[PDB]
Design a protein around this ligand. Structure first.
Ligand SMILES: CCCCCCCCCCCCCCCCCC(=O)OC[C@H](COP(=O)(O)O)OC(=O)CCCCCCCCCCCCCCCCC
Ligand SMILES: CCCCCCCCCCCC[N+](C)(C)[O-]
Lengths: 257, 51, 179, 68, 50, 223, 221, 102, 51, 51, 50
């Protein structure tokens, strides 16, 4: 049948187009994929190739969605993609919060600036720890788990079955991120508090001593000194315990159809 | 029935429960057809069932 | 081993038993990967290493084109004497009619005139079949009274058939006396 | 032009010859009858050829102009 | 249609005038979906930055 | 094929979509309350604006996506017939009532009525307003009249909520300061002490979870 | 040209060429490393993207040229080589191995394996045995499966290289911030002071020489 | 096993027997995958491993086309002596009418 | 069966469990075809099975 | 060694024996890579260094 | 469409001359509605992103 190859190419591009809606938001969140790094002509070419690498159905048979209102569908897929972008981002936002807490405790208020790639106010420490996490994650091969969880997201919940994120678990998310960050930053906050009270107590015997001004000279050195000791566990702590996994998809997503 | 049986998707949506006896299955089939609102046919090789 | 290639080759002017001789004389023949097919016919299968296969298929196609230029339908001239009759046509002027009797040449020629299928037989191997295909309309006969003989031009087979027909026709006539 | 790597004039002389015979004796009916046929066939041959060569040029040009 | 009826109907002017409609309309439909997805993603990125 | 004007309407709508969301949807409220609470805890950039906007966006979809889907299901309906521009206008307007009702629920009647007057009354030679009995106009305020009246009411609600969340943190600040004075450990700035306390206290009570539930329960039942 | 379909295919290829360069050549990597350097120094608009992409494309030429030349003479070659459909399809396929060898030499084995298995499970069904070719000769994988693995591998390694370059400037920034707090000038924006120290540091290193040397030596022995 | 290929072939100038003899002489024949059809007819079904199927199809097609160069409607000549009448047409010169008998 | 067997992609999804004795594979093949809802065929070279 | 080229050449008007003499007179002939074929016919195979 | 399906309209110069106008007027009308709509939404977008 003569026209069959022509139609078979059009089925391919319709499938890729509907996959872009779900893959591109992930490229927006992750720190090594956002347009602060990967921009211009490569960007679309790569996103499309990935989407075709993970689409779940044989590419040469007609797409099933031709009978459906396009906008409700596109919005559905974009919402799903935003949820996946958050869950995959989760290990990086914790280290970013940690760095912001440290740079706030040591003074250093004025150092920050808004990142144009994301619109987020970025301190000096926070940028460092946020990079360092990314590199250890990539080194451990997390990049494979990312495509894995994508593919599984299509097998376990399908565009045509109206897959939807679960509401109850979504309501806890912000608080779990804040909890993890605090639990991890705590050891430094404690020592810097004890330090400042110690100086205030000492001031009682010499009331002209500016115990406040002394603390600004001291606390940055103390901060770096202590973090240098507890630095090496940072590699295992994030790489495994915080990284998302394909097994969790069951609880965060379900099919409404 | 001694014949392969082929069911349309719109018939596949319907559910049934209970304990059934398959004797004189043609009669059973034609009765259930009217109770459940199906239509069916037989070309000589297999049985087709539709909503 | 995964690189093994194979092909089917077909020929029009050459036979597998010919092409083998070419390979042998060349010193290219290889008994591990011989050509497989029918010696009588021009179609064979070959399989083996790339270089070998490519060489074979090239050589066989180009030799077939070279032989395509040579004709082999050698025309043969046969001279046949008639022993029992006169070669020419004759006219007898009856009172009632002008009457004509046609000779052998005229009759046969008129009969074969415009024929297109091969001449098979008379009653009262690819290189062979392509000779047997010769059309019947090419046969030419010229009467030569000087020696009461016919000149016949055709293939060796055709001339033979003509000879048989002539010897079926020129019977000796009886004499009758009317009182 | 060859497709790289792909495996795989008599009528002019015949007309010239017939012309040379005829020119020697323009009044011979047999030479006239022969020349009429040779010239008619040569004419048809040249026309069919040049029409075909144009048809192939125009297909190649249309292809290029489609992507150009 | 896979090995039923016949292939290669490049040539009959009545069916060749039916193919023109389909070959055009499916190209337009596929072109439209490509824009809608870009718009949607762009709207999400616009809100999240702002 | 379809209709060439309905195609224009589709493409146009999809370009305006983010401004509609940003100005006529509960996103307006959710995105404000979170950022206010973040400032009150006194430590900007934790959580990120990315986290906050992302969550606010997701929650807004539970409220709004059913209404849009209901409207498209209303229009994809093969049994209608029309005769005139009026009969078509009526049916298209009727399609939007699902959204109109939501805006009417969450906005002020009198500000809506004020703009409903202001669209016209520069035309008018008269003072009487009774001239149409309410039952039509009360149902059919225009959408351009409803939109700004809705946004201006959402903002005010957001401030009302955030006000009550500020109070406990203020209290905590006063307590810390009074303790430092009662100890005479005077020359220490209290913020350094109280921001850790505010953070740990609010996280240890899951303020963000209670906050998210309390916001959604104005618009849905979770069960 | 001697054949019309051979012409149509050439014009199609020449129409899709730029995306193949944008997604299957080292250009994807050079382009990233230079933007990382500009981020590191804390600059916004200078050097321009057109200047950095200019040098990135020139440098990519030295690396890709030999296999493009090889493919060119391979397809021009005038010696008789094919006769029939199977020989033509094998001749065309054989002509691409010069480039499959390239993609395979730099793609990550784990990603190549993932994209291959996930295609087998599309075509032949998910019950087909998951290969786990842990010790492997990957049997000439399909180029549609091979190409996105290369793209993500180059993104990975370019990010990795870019990380290392930050660490000196990170030091510079935290030091300056500490000495200003030691003087109590809390209201001074450090960036004003730290920007020139970064510039002179990079110039003293001669960064662009070292970096452009090493980036090329990674592709040839 | 899942790679089995199969096809239907139809020839005009060659008999199934002729083709089977070709295969046998070649030593290519395989009794696990024989050709199925009518010896008299030219239409057969073949199924088996790829190499075998492809080879069979190509060989059959080419052999069929080759034989168009052949002709077999051999013309034959017979001599039939009339025992009871003259062969030629006869004219009777009636004094009032010329009559012809064919 | 003494023949190669080919099973379609859509039949391969179904699952079976138990002990089976192969005294008469033809009979067993027919019984299980009717029980599980399959159709099958035999060209003389191989057996083909479909949903 | 990996560069050895080879080709099949055929001539209409000139026999192999006629061509070998040409190469001999020229001083171009090389007994390590001689032409392979039938001295009578005009078709031969040659292989060797590119030049 | 009707003016083309009907055989007495599609074959009389008087009628063809009219159909040519109908087609052109249709083209211009739709093209202008599209243009002005785009310009309109583009103004909103320009102001709100400023
Ligand atoms: C202004 C004039 C109104 C024109 C309406 C005509 C539309 C028509 O009849 O053809 C359908 C046509 C679409 O064609 P279809 O998809 O094939 O049905 O035009 C449209 O694009 C539909 C636009 C109207 C639907 C309004 C829905 C508003 C829901 C509000 C939700 C707001 C937040 C978004 C949540 C995320
Ligand atoms: C997340 C936005 C995209 C998917 C659309 C979700 C529509 C709302 C469905 C809510 C169903 C809630 N429920 C089960 C209590 O009815």
């Amino acid at each position: 049948m003569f026209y069959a190859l022509y139609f078979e190419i059009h089925h391919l591009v319709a499938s890729a187009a509907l996959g872009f809606a779900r893959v591109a938001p992930i490229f927006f969140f992750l720190p090594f994929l956002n347009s602060g790094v990967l921009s211009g002509a490569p960007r679309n070419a790569i996103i499309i190739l990935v989407a075709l690498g993970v689409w779940p159905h044989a590419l040469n048979e007609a797409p099933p969605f031709l009978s459906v209102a396009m906008i409700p569908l596109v919005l559905q897929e974009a919402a799903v993609g935003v949820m996946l972008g958050c869950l995959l981002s989760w290990p990086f936002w914790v280290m970013h919060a940690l760095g912001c807490i440290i740079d706030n405790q040591r003074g250093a208020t004025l150092s920050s600036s808004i990142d144009p790639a994301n619109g987020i106010d970025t301190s000096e420490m926070a940028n460092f720890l946020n990079m360092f996490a990314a590199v250890v994650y990539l080194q451990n091969g997390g990049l494979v788990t990312m495509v894995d969880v994508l593919n599984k997201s299509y097998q376990l919940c399908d565009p045509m079955n109206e897959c939807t994120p679960s509401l109850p678990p979504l309501l806890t998310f912000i608080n779990q991120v804040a909890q993890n960050a605090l639990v991890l930053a705590s050891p430094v906050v404690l020592v810097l508090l004890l330090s400042e009270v110690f100086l205030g107590l000492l001031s009682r015997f010499a009331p002209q001593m500016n115990a406040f001004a002394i603390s600004l000279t001291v606390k940055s050195g103390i901060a770096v000194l202590i973090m240098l000791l507890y630095f090496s566990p940072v590699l295992p702590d994030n790489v495994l315990r915080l990284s998302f996994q394909a097994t969790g998809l069951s609880s965060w997503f379900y099919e409404r159809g | 029935l001694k014949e392969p049986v082929i069911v349309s998707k719109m018939a596949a949506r319907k559910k049934i429960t209970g304990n059934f006896e398959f004797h004189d299955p043609n009669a059973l089939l034609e009765k259930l057809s009217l109770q459940l609102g199906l239509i069916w046919y037989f070309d000589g090789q297999a049985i087709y069932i539709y909503d | 081993a995964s690189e093994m290639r194979n092909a089917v080759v077909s020929l029009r002017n050459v036979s597998l038993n010919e092409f083998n001789n070419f390979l042998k004389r060349s010193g290219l023949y290889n008994k591990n990967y011989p050509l497989r097919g029918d010696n009588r016919k021009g179609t064979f299968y070959v399989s083996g290493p790339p270089v070998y296969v490519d060489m074979v298929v090239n050589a066989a196609t180009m030799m077939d084109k070279q032989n395509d230029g040579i004709e082999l339908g050698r025309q043969k001239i046969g001279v046949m004497r008639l022993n029992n009759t006169f070669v020419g046509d004759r006219t007898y002027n009856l009172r009632d009619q002008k009457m004509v009797i046609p000779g052998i040449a005229t009759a046969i020629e008129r009969l074969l005139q415009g024929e297109e299928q091969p001449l098979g037989n008379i009653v009262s191997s690819l290189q062979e079949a392509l000779k047997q295909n010769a059309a019947a309309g090419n046969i030419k006969i010229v009467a030569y009274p000087d020696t009461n003989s016919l000149l016949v031009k055709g293939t060796a087979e055709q001339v033979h058939f003509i000879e048989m027909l002539v010897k079926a026709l020129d019977v000796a006539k009886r004499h009758v006396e009317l009182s | 032009t060859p497709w790289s790597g792909y495996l795989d004039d008599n009528l002019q002389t015949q007309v010239t010859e017939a012309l040379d015979k005829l020119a020697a004796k323009p009044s011979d009916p047999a030479l006239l009858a022969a020349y009429q046929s040779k010239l008619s066939e040569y004419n048809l041959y040249r026309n069919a050829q040049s029409n075909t060569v144009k048809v192939f040029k125009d297909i190649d040009a249309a292809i290029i102009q489609n992507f150009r | 249609t896979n090995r039923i009826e016949d292939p290669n109907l490049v040539t009959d002017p009545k069916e060749l005038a039916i193919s023109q409609e389909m070959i055009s309309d499916y190209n337009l439909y596929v072109s439209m979906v490509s824009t809608l997805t870009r718009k949607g993603v762009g709207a999400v990125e616009t809100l999240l930055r702002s | 094929m379809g209709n060439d004007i309905s195609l224009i309407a589709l493409l146009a709508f999809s370009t305006l979509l983010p401004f509609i969301i940003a100005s006529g949807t509960c996103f307006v409220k959710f995105s404000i309350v979170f950022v206010m609470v973040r400032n009150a805890l006194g430590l900007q950039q934790i959580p990120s604006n990315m986290t906050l906007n992302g969550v606010a966006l997701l929650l807004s979809m539970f409220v709004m996506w059913p209404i849009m889907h209901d409207a498209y299901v209303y229009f994809e309906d093969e049994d209608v017939t029309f005769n005139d521009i009026s009969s078509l206008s009526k049916h298209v307007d009727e399609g939007l009532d699902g959204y109109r009702d939501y805006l009417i629920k969450y906005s002020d009647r009198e500000l809506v009525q004020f703009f409903e007057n202001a669209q016209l009354k520069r035309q008018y030679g008269e003072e009487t307003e009774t001239v149409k009995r309410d039952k039509d106009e009360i149902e059919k305020p225009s959408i351009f009249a409803l939109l700004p009246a809705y946004a201006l009411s959402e903002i005010k609600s957001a401030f009302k909520i955030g006000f009550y969340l500020y109070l406990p943190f203020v209290v905590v600040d006063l307590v810390v300061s009074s303790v430092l004075l009662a100890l005479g450990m005077m020359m220490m700035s209290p913020v350094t002490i109280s921001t850790p306390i505010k953070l740990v206290l609010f996280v240890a009570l899951d303020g963000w979870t209670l906050l998210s539930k309390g916001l959604i329960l104005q618009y849905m039942d979770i069960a």
